[PDB]
Symmetry: C2
Subunit: 210 residues, 2 copies
């Protein structure tokens, strides 16, 4: 019985500036924090925890920024894959092959029997998502149906809750296509500063909406 | 350096309960307020003011509620259409045809030369929007491109700022397909209670934001 949570990670540069550390050290703190957050989501009974790893636009950042970010997220999967089910999706042709190869190996290696899923979406972009779906079915079905669209969207189910820390109130290409009834929560706390209590009051806010 | 603005109207039932008036009277206040808001948006230099009139789900309400809402929205256009450019889009097959006929007549009567556009989107729903675009081009083009998608999306351009009063922090069926970096502003104030000052403070918030578009400056 699915209940899901999606996190839009944010704040790594401001956190590096705040702490007087490198962007690499800030992304290392992000790796730690995302492992924590994954554990929190699991304890709270969410069936899938979605993490919006990257947009298409993110891959126009520098090669060093792309490498730093992708290694930090992948490291989350390296640490967690043995104890959960891992999956990923998105505009895979814009992800550098090194990360796709490692993430595919980790997905194949993950605990498929787990009742908890960590799911990465990479290269998020509604335009690219729709274009890929069209090109897949173009001329091959009489009409596109809601069922087929849902079966081919990057996020394979509706999102219950979406959280974006870091003070930006925007989706930044990370909006989940098939979630018309998702509740959103934004907070100024930088991701790397989020505590379990911050997460819990975020969930109080999200769950109490009448 | 041109900008556009989108409003997600909300709160008519709660406002009728708050004021102790009929739903019809609440939608009449909404009509008045949306005329105000359109004027405010024009004064602030926005090139287009988009209003998310309805979702597909809205049309599963009773026929009386649908008629009340659609008449209240159309009345905005009846009052202002002569001095601006009016246009509309969306999942038009779920809109009762009466309103489509009237809105088309109002569009023809509007000032297409105006430097300000009021644009209604009706029957918003990303699933229906995508399904409509697919079914339109299914088997008739070699591949879908970003240009064709952009040229066929309900909202004909990326949205800069969107405002949702009414206290719900969610997009419902109203997220604009081709606006990956739209800035969003939520406030608890009901639409029918929004003042010019509320709008201005929203604009201070929205205009002060550092827009990065996924890049590192």
């Amino acid at each position: 019985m699915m209940t899901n949570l999606m996190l839009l990670p944010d704040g790594m540069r401001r956190w590096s500036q705040k702490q007087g550390i490198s962007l690499d050290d800030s992304y290392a703190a992000m790796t730690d924090k995302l492992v924590e957050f994954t554990g929190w989501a699991r304890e709270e009974g969410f069936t899938t925890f979605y993490v919006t790893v990257s947009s298409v636009a993110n891959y126009s950042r520098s090669e060093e920024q792309v490498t730093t970010a992708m290694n930090a997220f992948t490291e989350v999967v390296r640490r967690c894959h043995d104890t959960l089910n891992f999956n990923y999706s998105g505009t895979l042709e814009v992800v550098p092959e090194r990360w796709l190869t490692e993430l595919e190996a980790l997905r194949a290696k993950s605990d498929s029997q787990s009742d908890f899923t960590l799911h990465f979406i990479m290269g998020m972009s509604l335009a690219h998502e729709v274009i890929g779906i069209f090109n897949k079915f173009n001329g091959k079905i009489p009409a596109l149906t809601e069922e087929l669209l849902a079966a081919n969207a990057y996020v394979p189910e509706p999102v219950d809750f979406l959280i974006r820390p870091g003070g930006h109130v925007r989706m930044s290409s990370f909006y989940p296509l098939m979630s018309p009834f998702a509740e959103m929560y934004f907070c100024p706390t930088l991701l790397n500063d989020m505590t379990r209590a911050d997460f819990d009051v975020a969930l109080e806010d999200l769950r109490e909406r009448d």
